[PDB]
C-alpha cells in the first residue's frame, strides 16, 4: 500500500519476519519495524549466541576495518538479516533497503500510532510451545550492545503513558455506549438499517 507499514517486532521470529518485510520493500512499500529487541529466534539462547559469535569471528585477516561489519544493535541485526534477503548490490535492492526503517524500542514518531502484526512470522503460531527460543535483545546485549538498560527504561516510560491513553480511550467508549442507550428512540430507525445488512449485529 501507499502508506507506511509499522510492524511490532515483539513475538516475531527473526527470519520469518525478515522474509515478509523483504518482499514488501521490493514491492515499493515503506516498512517500519519497531521493538527489534523483542524479536525472537528459534532454538535455545546459547546456540543462537554461538551463531553470532561465529559471525564475530568472520573478519578480514589483512584489515578488519574493511572486513564484515558486525552490528550489535537488535535493529541493525534485523536490518542486516533483511539485507541478506534483498539484491542489495543492485539499484533496485538498494532502493528497497532504503524503504525499511528499523528501531530499538518505539520512537516518538511511531509510539502514538497503531502497530501491525504478521501472524505468519509470530512465535506463538510458528513455533511449538515446548521448543526453546532466544530474545534478540538479550542476544544483542551479551555480544556488544550498550543500550539495553536505557531502552528498557524508555520503554517502561512509554508503556506508562500508553496506559493513560488506553484508560481515556476506555472511558470514551464507556461514554459512547451510554450515549447509545440514551439516544435509542431516535436511533432505532438507523440501527435497523445497519442490522439488515450485517453491520451492528
Amino acid at each position: 500500500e501507499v502508506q507506511v507499514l509499522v510492524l511490532d517486532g515483539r513475538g516475531h521470529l527473526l527470519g520469518r519476519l525478515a522474509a515478509i518485510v523483504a518482499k514488501q520493500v521490493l514491492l515499493g512499500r515503506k516498512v517500519v519495524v519497531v521493538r527489534c529487541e523483542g524479536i525472537n529466534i528459534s532454538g535455545n539462547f546459547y546456540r543462537n549466541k554461538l551463531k553470532y559469535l561465529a559471525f564475530l569471528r568472520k573478519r578480514m585477516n589483512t584489515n578488519p576495518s574493511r572486513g564484515p561489519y558486525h552490528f550489535r544493535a537488535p535493529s541493525r541485526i534485523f536490518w542486516r538479516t533483511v539485507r541478506g534477503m534483498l539484491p542489495h548490490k543492485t539499484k533496485r535492492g538498494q532502493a528497497a533497503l532504503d524503504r525499511l526503517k528499523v528501531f530499538d524500542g518505539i520512537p516518538p514518531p511511531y509510539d502514538k500510532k497503531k502497530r501491525m502484526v504478521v501472524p505468519a512470522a509470530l512465535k506463538v503460531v510458528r513455533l511449538k510451545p515446548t521448543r526453546k527460543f532466544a530474545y534478540l535483545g538479550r542476544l544483542a546485549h551479551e555480544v556488544g550492545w550498550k543500550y539495553q538498560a536505557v531502552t528498557a527504561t524508555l520503554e517502561e516510560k512509554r508503556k506508562e503513558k500508553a496506559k493513560i491513553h488506553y484508560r481515556k480511550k476506555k472511558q470514551l467508549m464507556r461514554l459512547r455506549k451510554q450515549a447509545e442507550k440514551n439516544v435509542e428512540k431516535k436511533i432505532d430507525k438507523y440501527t435497523e438499517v445497519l442490522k439488515t445488512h450485517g453491520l451492528l449485529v
Binding site: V183, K186, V201
Partner: peptide, 27 residues
C-alpha cells in the same frame, strides 16, 4: 450478519452509508 454484509449491493451500501452517517452524528 457476516453473510448479509457480503451480499450487500451498491444501493444497499449507499443506504447504509446514509444511515450510519445520521446515527454517528446523533450518537
Amino acid at each position: 450478519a457476516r453473510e448479509r454484509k457480503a451480499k450487500m449491493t451498491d444501493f444497499d451500501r449507499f443506504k447504509v452509508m446514509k444511515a450510519k452517517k445520521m446515527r454517528n452524528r446523533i450518537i
